[PDB]
Design a binder for this molecule. Structure first.
Ligand SMILES: Nc1ncnc2c1ncn2[C@@H]1O[C@H](COP(=O)(O)OP(=O)(O)NP(=O)(O)O)[C@@H](O)[C@H]1O
Ligand SMILES: Nc1ncnc2c1ncn2[C@@H]1O[C@H](COP(=O)(O)OP(=O)(O)NP(=O)(O)O)[C@@H](O)[C@H]1O
Ligand SMILES: Nc1ncnc2c1ncn2[C@@H]1O[C@H](COP(=O)(O)OP(=O)(O)NP(=O)(O)O)[C@@H](O)[C@H]1O
Ligand SMILES: Nc1ncnc2c1ncn2[C@@H]1O[C@H](COP(=O)(O)OP(=O)(O)NP(=O)(O)O)[C@@H](O)[C@H]1O
Ligand SMILES: Nc1ncnc2c1ncn2[C@@H]1O[C@H](COP(=O)(O)OP(=O)(O)NP(=O)(O)O)[C@@H](O)[C@H]1O
Ligand SMILES: Nc1ncnc2c1ncn2[C@@H]1O[C@H](COP(=O)(O)OP(=O)(O)NP(=O)(O)O)[C@@H](O)[C@H]1O
Ligand SMILES: [Mg+2]
Ligand SMILES: [Mg+2]
Ligand SMILES: [Mg+2]
Ligand SMILES: [Mg+2]
Ligand SMILES: [Mg+2]
Ligand SMILES: [Mg+2]
Lengths: 246, 246, 246, 246, 246, 246
């Protein structure tokens, strides 16, 4: 499995939440590996869009060192009918069942389910397939850890899937001026002086931006002349904030 | 039929409800076997998710000692169209009809019917097949006991299926501190001292957790260091409770 | 045609309604046989679930002594598409049209129409086929009596089918303590003493239970020890009553 | 074309409405035959169920003496898909277009359109086919009179079809005690004395029963002993009345 | 192209609106022919049912003298699936694109789109095809004038098609007693004396009848005896009026 | 790729917004070309209908000088099923992925998605394909800039697509009398004197017309006699304004 594809810009420790996600992930891996009572363990990584769910799921899977690791993604099922998706999924789980210790990542569940809020509309046959697969224990003695990711926990709850996962792990956006500065420093993009200015403008204030989104705002800001990079970054950050009124 | 698959962690007598379910199940088995008036008997085991419905249904079926016993599960029908499911079901009942005394378990009815609350949506052709099969007597002189399971009695009622079953048996979650401790003791997971602490924290208080869910919380708690296992268990139990406001 | 299959436990005269149903049925048979003005006569037997509609329809058909008698049932059309059901129905009526005097029973119309209250949903193509067949006179000079059965008169009315039948015959549940005792006596299940006790508990009081449902409650009660059979029967009857508030 | 099939019990002159329907029908036939301006004329016979629409349409068509006369009925299209019905209809009109003077009866439009009030549901492809055919003039110089029938004028109006017909002719139920007695006398069913009694009970009072329905009530009443025939007829008439409150 | 088929009863100048429609049509033809900036021009002729939209569209197209003129009509697509209609349309436009100067009439858009107000229902694939075709310029240097007709401008607006047309031309019903008399005179149907009477009854009063509908009322009135023709005409006109309350 | 087809009447600098759109477009092109962090950049050009979105998107793409440039348009997918559209799209992106630096324009998204406000209705399979493609990075090291266009930003937001684009660029209609005059002058259509008159009538006043729509109004006005061209233009502009009440 190619993780570089799912962890294109590493896993930077911008804040304690990152460590929490990884540590809780390892606990589930350990449980899956050593428990006879629960040979099947499932966890849903959920949070706001762009918070870093897919990369963290891939990282947890990578760190498991399991003999079988497979990531189920919407990427190679574009245009697939409900039945075709179900068959592709059954194939992945069937292969996993042949391993003594396996990890399957079901990435971007709302996309796998062809979900759209207007209606709403979605592929029920695929939803039903997942509900069954999430509860199906591998052959006696074999173990499986299923890691799902979503930016729509609310929808999955309404679909009664949230109750199918053993547990869920929240993957929050960067939420404080300090976490933001930590991310910038670890990413090493602005000049020492520019970060001091940014810190002056954000420290103490609340922020709400996903790590993936932060990468984009940084690159956009860097296209500006040196004198305007910080101004541009702060303006973009101002537009990518959380609605005070919702 | 492989029951070990459906009764992976035994049938522990955590409380009187367990005995009630099994005893009422045996009465229905006896009626099916000895009655000429009602050669067809059906019962719906229903309760909250994870309360132990499938395992108990499998146990009732196993204890019947009937020459023909078959469990109809969503597991091998993932991605199946409505028609395909109906044919798979007709096959099972047709085989049952060839036996003088048979028991068919129709497990996880909401999943067999591809039910989802959003809409709602479901496979009506499959619902109709079940409504007919639940009322169809085997060839004259032959007997059949149908045992269905569901975590959604309300939905089946609205579908007018609840009225198709001869009777229903409630499979409750563990509901008292005493039943909880009994389960823990029978499962033998915590140290004698740890259970005393748990008893101190739960005795007298109300609880509402399904046996299957309890197994998961236990295993999660055991991944903690010895000094933190009880704290973790109680915290998880606190999150898996019933909403006081609904 | 096998009536034993549709009249598994006879036709007991538990009350005057039974005689009324049969007498009105014979009048329609006579009209169909002797009228030149109305060579096509249709009647809908309707009532609460389990009231005995199918058995009575089969009995009316049997007593007609017509050269052609066929019962159209959902039993052999499980999983059938709308088109497949329509073709199966057309076949039955086409065969009937070849006879000078025929009777076709269209049993469990809500099931033939794949009806479910959620939505609601149903097979309109099948509904339309029935609406046409109910009004189609056999070849000139030939006669046909169509007997339909349903537990959902309200739904058929809304579908404008009720207006397609020549008339309807109500098949009520047992409604008085006296009719209940008459049924028990004719079925001869309890000891002379046990019926006196039951009579003491129900006489004068209102009841509302279908004959088919009564058979089931009796058999369930008989699985109890002799000393507890009556207590069990009365408890079950108490649960199978009509809602005072609806 | 077999009219005997569509006019099984003649066309009795029970009241002035019958003459009106036939006279207006002949005027349309005359217009279709002699007009160069309107080579295509369409008329919708509409009224309550059982009022005699189909028989009158067939009679108007028969009296036209047109070289081409065809009745399009739901009878031979049971189970037909929308496309199949459209093709069957196109065939009839295509044949009509080959005649210099033709009459096509489109009978029971609500049934041809697979209409049901629940939803509602209907075959839009068939509706669209009719909307186009109702407005399509035959080849230059050729003439066509289209006669449709329905018991649901309201629905056709909502479908914007009512506006596609050149005009409509109301086919009312028998509405007065005098028209009722006239029908009975012309049908010659009761004894001279029995009609005097009926007249005594209905004269001056309002009635609302379709001629086809009247035929059925008469036959049902005749199955009674001589002394009870009138009582039965009046009781049935009492149940087949119009709701004072709707 | 056969215009006689679409202009069966000529184009009479009953009022100024007729001249306006034709003059505005010619301006669009001229623009299409001489403009390099707008090689693609589209216009929607819209008005009440029977106002004469199709005939006027055909007339505008005929007067263009364009080397390629094609009328797309629902007439030869009865029973066609959405895909089949789209292909038929693509064929017409593809042929038009091969001409240096073309005119395509898309007649009765609501019928091409299988529109019905109940639901509503319509063929979205066909709507989408039209939305694209209405905005697609012919190969560089080639010109195309698209003329659509509809009696449902409101619906097309809601479908966002009205915004796809370059402009729209209103085709009103005859709206004044004077325009009505002008039409009658040009059609030359009543006796000189009869028109004086009609004028006496309508002059000064408002009217609202489509030219096509007027043709029908005239022919119906002519089927009456000479003494009753005017009375009949006025009575029919009275029924074909506009609702004062809507 | 043929841009002349998508930029039929050039890109005139009628106002500062035009320069803004092009400059922001170039910044995104530069970012796509030089960034390692964001190899995938997407931008949605959105604005009122006819504001010039497609031409500007094509211009931004043309100015990128990328080795691979492809415009995905609804034009060659008329009548295509959802699956067929998805396959056509996958083909374009797959080809783009083979290039080191590519630009794909996804034009008229509401049309690609078969969107209609009534219902609403749309092709969810196509929407899902776009949601995945908008987030899929090209093979490691390769770069892709996706430029979408729409006149319905609101709808895309509700579909959660707006959140899939890296950013959006507003393409406004001409909004001031000065911008209008600048457009007219650059297009060089009216006589020096006529523009002075127009300026007199619009200067200081607000306007809201898309450049593409302006081209049409100009051509329509030019079909008038010299003395009436300005009057016609102003009248048309008066009808193509923004609703003060919405
Ligand atoms: N601590 C971190 N956690 C997660 N991703 C990180 C972290 N540090 C850097 N990244 C990078 O940030 C990006 C996160 O993208 P991704 O994992 O696709 O987000 P996502 O929340 O799954 N997106 P979406 O599914 O679009 O909401 C990847 O390029 C990661 O390599
Ligand atoms: N008394 C008991 N009753 C039922 N299951 C028990 C009992 N004691 C232990 N178990 C175990 O608990 C688990 C119950 O799981 P299961 O029977 O699948 O629950 P369920 O309620 O059918 N689940 P779901 O269908 O997901 O709501 C099995 O592993 C059983 O072996
Ligand atoms: N008087 C009676 N009328 C009808 N059935 C009777 C009577 N006496 C005994 N029975 C028996 O009671 C049973 C009635 O079952 P059935 O005719 O299937 O009921 P139903 O109302 O058609 N059921 P459902 O369609 O499930 O509502 C049969 O076994 C009959 O033989
Ligand atoms: N004056 C009459 N008008 C019409 N039918 C008549 C008349 N006199 C006798 N009849 C008979 O009455 C019956 C009318 O049935 P039919 O024409 O099918 O009614 P309908 O209104 O079309 N029925 P439906 O379509 O079920 O509402 C036929 O048998 C006719 O022969
Ligand atoms: N000035 C006129 N304008 C239009 N049609 C005219 C005129 N004078 C006479 N006619 C005739 O009136 C008829 C109009 O019919 P048509 O053009 O089909 O109307 P329409 O409004 O398109 N109908 P519909 O689509 O059913 O609303 C044709 O027979 C024309 O020849
Ligand atoms: N500054 C400009 N920006 C955009 N288009 C321009 C400009 N100047 C001239 N044009 C021309 O104006 C027309 C714009 O049409 P187009 O780009 O299709 O608009 P659109 O907003 O994409 N249309 P739609 O998709 O129908 O809302 C083209 O012919 C352009 O060549
Ligand atoms: Mg992700
Ligand atoms: Mg279960
Ligand atoms: Mg029945
Ligand atoms: Mg009829
Ligand atoms: Mg027209
Ligand atoms: Mg565009």
């Amino acid at each position: 499995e190619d993780y570089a594809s799912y962890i294109m810009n590493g896993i930077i420790k911008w804040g304690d939440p990152v460590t929490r996600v990884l540590d809780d992930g390892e606990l589930l891996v350990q449980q899956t590996k050593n428990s006879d009572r629960t040979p099947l363990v499932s966890v849903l990584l959920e949070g706001p869009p762009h918070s870093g769910k897919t990369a963290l799921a891939a990282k947890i899977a990578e760190e498991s060192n399991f003999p079988f690791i497979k990531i189920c993604s919407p990427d190679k099922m574009i245009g697939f009918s409900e039945t075709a998706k179900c068959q592709a999924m059954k194939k992945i789980f069937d292969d996993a069942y042949k391993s003594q210790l396996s990890c399957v990542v079901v990435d971007d569940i709302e996309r796998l389910l062809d979900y759209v809020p207007i209606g709403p509309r979605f592929s029920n046959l695929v939803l039903q397939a997942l509900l069954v697969l999430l509860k199906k224990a591998p052959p006696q003695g074999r173990k499986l850890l299923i890691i799902g990711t979503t930016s729509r926990k609310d929808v999955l709850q309404e679909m009664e899937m949230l109750n199918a996962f053993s547990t869920t792990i929240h993957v929050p956006n960067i939420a404080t001026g300090e976490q933001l500065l930590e991310a910038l420093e670890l990413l090493g993009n602005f000049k020492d002086k520019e970060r001091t200015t940014i810190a002056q403008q954000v420290k103490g204030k609340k922020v709400w931006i996903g790590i993936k989104k932060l990468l984009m705002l940084i690159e956009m800001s860097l296209q500006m002349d040196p004198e305007y990079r910080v101004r541009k970054f702060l303006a973009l950050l101002r537009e990518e904030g959380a609605s005070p009124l919702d």
